[PDB]
Amino acid sequence: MIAQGQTLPNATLSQLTVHHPVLELFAGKKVVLFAVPGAFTPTDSEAHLPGYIVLADQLKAKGVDLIASVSVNDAFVMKAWGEAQNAEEILMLADGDASFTKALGLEMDTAGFGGLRSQRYAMIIDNGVVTTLNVEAPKSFEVSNAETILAALEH
Amino acid sequence: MIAQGQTLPNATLSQLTVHHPVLELFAGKKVVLFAVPGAFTPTDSEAHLPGYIVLADQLKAKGVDLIASVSVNDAFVMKAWGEAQNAEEILMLADGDASFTKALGLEMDTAGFGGLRSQRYAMIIDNGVVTTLNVEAPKSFEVSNAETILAALEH
């Protein structure tokens, strides 16, 4: 499992418009990246993603250059999810085969639900280096929400 | 790979409303089942699924009791996809971990796109027995469409 202080693995995340190398996409920026177990699922669609949409400008007021969401979904599902949620301020990234997630050691087996998905987490990434890493407790939503990240930028 | 004349594996397919045992869900019925590589993808959303929605009553006029679509997606994505497409006549089934698909030998590795997905195919299932099996050629859409299935029910 990746830890604070490490640079992200040189992996790729896809977007429908491109296979972004995350080391190039996040370079020179303060990036907030939060991961969800699945597009269109309840917690992700009713709490997690909406929380970052609502606080997007507050986060950018505190120096964030880019807010991004990643999920083990394909880019077509991620694009349709962003439109359903009106997540214009959020960059939706697809980890369709969970290769980025596995390289982080942050995968989890949801078995019959949806196979390998990402654990729920949130990071603050400064020029590719993981500065803050908030990984949720199983089936819990407490530390990866936008409010906690905002309070981390308070220090 | 499963073949005509065999009964389906005693696997489960999920729906958001339930882990349907397919041997019980399809029993006593003439079922048309078609599989797509992914919800919200272009061919599936613009050609494959719409073709079965448009010809649903014609298929049932020729003795089909149930039209079902399966995909290696989770049940939340499948439900949201059905609503986006207005697929009220179609039963959307989720094979989230591709266990049903792998038991059929009809999986395919889409690598970085979306990991393991289903090959595109269409079956006619009579009381759990595969009567007709139309499996597409790679990246081809010719034999699994509603029109071909309709012409199979012609004989």
Author numbering:
A (entry chain A), B (entry chain A): 1 to 17, 22 to 159
Sentences from the paper on this structure:
V. vulnificus Prx3 (VvPrx3) belongs to the 1-Cys class of Prxs, with one conserved catalytic cysteine (Cys48), and has been shown to be involved in pathogenicity in a mouse model. Cys48 is the CP residue that is crucial for the function of the protein. All three crystal structures of VvPrx3 revealed a protomer exhibiting a compact and spherical structure without a C-terminal extension region, similar to the previously reported 1-Cys Prx AhpE from Mycobacterium tuberculosis. All three crystal structures of VvPrx3 [reduced Prx3 (C48D/C73S), oxidized Prx3 (C73S) and H2O2-bound Prx3 (C48D/C73S)] showed a similar dimeric assembly in the crystals characterized by an A-type dimeric interface, similar to that in AhpE from M. tuberculosis.
To study the structure of Prx3 in the reduced state, crystals of a VvPrx3 (C48D/C73S) variant were also obtained. The CP Cys48 in VvPrx3 was replaced with a non-oxidizable Asp residue, which could also partly mimic an over-oxidized form (Cys-SO2H) of VvPrx3. The crystal belonged to a different space group, P3221, and the VvPrx3 (C48D/C73S) structure [named reduced Prx (C48D/C73S) in this study] was determined by the molecular replacement approach. The crystal structure representing the reduced Prx3 showed a typical dimeric interface, called the A-type interface.
